[PDB]
Design a protein around this ligand. Structure first.
Ligand SMILES: [Ca+2]
Ligand SMILES: [Ca+2]
Ligand SMILES: [Ca+2]
Ligand SMILES: [Ca+2]
Ligand SMILES: [Zn+2]
Length: 316
């Protein structure tokens, strides 16, 4: 929309109050002109026709419960944009400020959120398994990171390359949650998953086996479901990333942690300079080792901890 930039106020999915960048032109729209070529949030109105209509509001205050998922999709897309810009100098997902579009209220009782090749899509959940999925900052950042991966490595969405794809999104989703300091942890989707149960999540990076995923290459899923286990075998890489950052002893192999900032830098370089569409876990190890070598030198602790962490999860 052509109009005047302004700032509105609203409440997110979890009842927190936040300010959001909006655009005024008769109505107030969820259009943030301050980032790149814009952040645009649409209402799918409980259907599956996308994108639906650009969110319009009459008084620039977004406190209705119907508004909450849009507040958070809009706001958290902005925080994710800021993370990539400020920490990795990457301007939007294509590296040239492409506009970021999201649609909320997609379908009815839809327990998922996804990047569809051109935009983010968020279900409202069924109220028991999930609450509106844009309330999870890691969920939002996980899905927008698929857009980054599509424009850089192009990891295909199946088997080991698909599991790397998934793990990269869980890694950057987590790092965005730490960057915003929004009650951070190494779990995925705990803020919106099962509202009646405390302390669980969809996946854990510090201990993937807590929810049934493998934490070692010998335990990998080798069947055909979930596109060859893209959301299951990502646990092996997630555990490795957790060890690189936090350190630990896993199956008797001790890893000295190098922190989240170095983890983000090493995986960001591997993703954008050495991974290809069909990379497997073994190639990811080489990419991460070379990336750390590039950045810190071949005899550094950082390279040592990358190799130790892949050793600990059985990936050579
Ligand atoms: Ca209003
Ligand atoms: Ca958290
Ligand atoms: Ca989390
Ligand atoms: Ca829960
Ligand atoms: Zn994903």
């Amino acid at each position: 929309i052509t109009g005047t930039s302004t700032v509105g106020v609203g409440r997110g999915v979890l009842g927190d109050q936040k300010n959001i960048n909006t655009t005024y032109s008769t109505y107030y729209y969820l259009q943030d002109n301050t980032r790149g070529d814009g952040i645009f949030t649409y209402d799918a109105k409980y259907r599956t026709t996308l994108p639906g209509s650009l969110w319009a509001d009459a008084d620039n205050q977004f406190f209705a419960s119907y508004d909450a998922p849009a507040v958070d999709a809009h706001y958290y897309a902005g925080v994710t944009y800021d993370y990539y810009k400020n920490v990795h100098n990457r301007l939007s997902y294509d590296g040239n400020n492409a506009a970021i579009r999201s649609s909320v209220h997609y379908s009815q009782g839809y327990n998922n959120a996804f990047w569809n090749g051109s935009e983010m899509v968020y279900g409202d959940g069924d109220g028991q398994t999930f609450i509106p999925l844009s309330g999870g900052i890691d969920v939002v950042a996980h899905e927008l990171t698929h857009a980054v991966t599509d424009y850089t490595a192009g990891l295909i969405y199946q088997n080991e390359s698909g599991a790397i794809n998934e793990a990269i999104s869980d890694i950057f989703g987590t790092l965005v949650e730490f960057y915003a300091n929004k009650n951070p942890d190494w779990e995925i989707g705990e803020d919106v998953y099962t509202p009646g149960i405390s302390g669980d999540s969809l996946r854990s990076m510090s201990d993937p086996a807590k929810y049934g995923d493998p934490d070692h290459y010998s335990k990998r899923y080798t069947g055909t479901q979930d596109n060859g286990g893209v959301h299951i075998n990502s646990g092996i890489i997630n555990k490795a990333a957790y060890l690189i950052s936090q350190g630990g002893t896993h199956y008797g192999v001790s890893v000295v942690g190098i922190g989240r900032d170095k983890l983000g830098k090493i995986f960001y370089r591997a993703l954008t300079q050495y991974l290809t569409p069909t990379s497997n876990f073994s190639q990811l190890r080489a990419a991460a080792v070379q990336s750390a070598t590039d950045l810190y030198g071949s005899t550094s602790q950082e390279v040592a901890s990358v190799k130790q962490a892949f050793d600990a999860v059985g990936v050579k």
